[PDB]
Amino acid sequence: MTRIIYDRKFLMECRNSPVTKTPPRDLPTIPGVTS
């Protein structure tokens, strides 16, 4: 019910989850951006 706030520490910690290693399914193919 309250505003969702994340500090830097928590956000960096979440990066260690294996799901972050999977590309977005509908990730466009663009040279020099996603290549």
Partner 1 sequence: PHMKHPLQNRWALWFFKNDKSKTWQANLRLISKFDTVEDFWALYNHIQLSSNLMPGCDYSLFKDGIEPMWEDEKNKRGGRWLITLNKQQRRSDLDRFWLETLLCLIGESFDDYSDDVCGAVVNVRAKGDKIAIWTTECENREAVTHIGRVYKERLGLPPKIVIGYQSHADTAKNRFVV
Q: From CA 8, how far away is CA 17, in angstroms rounded?
A: 16
Answer yes or no whether residue 1 interacts with partner 1 by CB under 8 A. Answer: no
Q: Which residue has the tokens 């996603």?
A: 34
Answer yes or no whether residue 29 interacts with partner 1 by CB under 8 A. Answer: no
- Which pair of tokens denotes residue 13? 């910690």
Q: How far is the CB of 2 from partner 1 (least distance, A)?
A: 10
| Per-residue CA distances from 18 to 4, 15, 31 (Å) | 23, 8, 26
Answer yes or no whether residue 27 interacts with partner 1 by CB under 8 A. Answer: yes
Q: Where do contacts with partner 1 occur on this chain (CB under 8 A)?
A: 3-8, 10-11, 14-15, 17, 19-24, 26-28, 30, 32-35
